[PDB]
Each structure stands twice: as C-alpha cells, then as structure tokens.
C-alpha cells in the first residue's frame, strides 16, 4: 500500500532534483537510473512489467546509492517516494 500524498517542499531537495532530470530525461548520475522496478513484493499497484521505473535520490556523503529512490509510474503525475529501500512509499504531490 501507499501511505499517503506528501508535498515535493516537504520531501529532501535531492528529490526535486531528481524529479527535474526524470523531466529531461536526464543524463543521470547512476548507470541504475532508469530500470524497471518489478514491485515484486506488491507494496504498490498491480500493473504490468514495465510500467515502474526507478531513479536515484542522493543522499548527501554517502558512498552508495543509499535507500531514497523515486519510483515512477506511466500515469501523469504518478511518482513514489521511497526513503527506507523500497519498504514504504509515498505519493510525490508536485503542486506544494
């Protein structure tokens, strides 16, 4: 399940720059960017392969690529929030 919508100010500043390169259609800064997530474990909506794609949050001095991601869906507007690897989720509302 989803647990509800936040607004983009509320979430870290990466996401709004993660946001601006999904609009671009990049370049992105990980070589992951872009695949299909497969929501294998049903925490969001049934839909087929192919309709979820992941990109990278930063997370500021880390190493890795960390926990924080946005999951797009192929709906307008239709972007998850994950701060925890993909355990939770939130709608990103871009209006606030």
């Given at each position: ?7 983009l100010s509320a979430l870290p500043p990466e996401a709004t720059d993660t946001l601006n390169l999904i609009a ?73």
């Open positions: 399940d989803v647990s509800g919508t936040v607004c671009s259609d990049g370049p992105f800064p990980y070589s992951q960017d872009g695949v299909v997530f497969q929501n294998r474990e049903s925490v969001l909506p049934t839909q087929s392969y192919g309709y979820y794609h992941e990109y990278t949050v930063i997370t500021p001095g880390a190493r890795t690529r960390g926990t924080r991601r946005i999951i797009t869906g192929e709906a307008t507007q239709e972007d998850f929030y994950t701060g925890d690897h993909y355990a939770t989720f939130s709608l990103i509302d871009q209006t606030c």
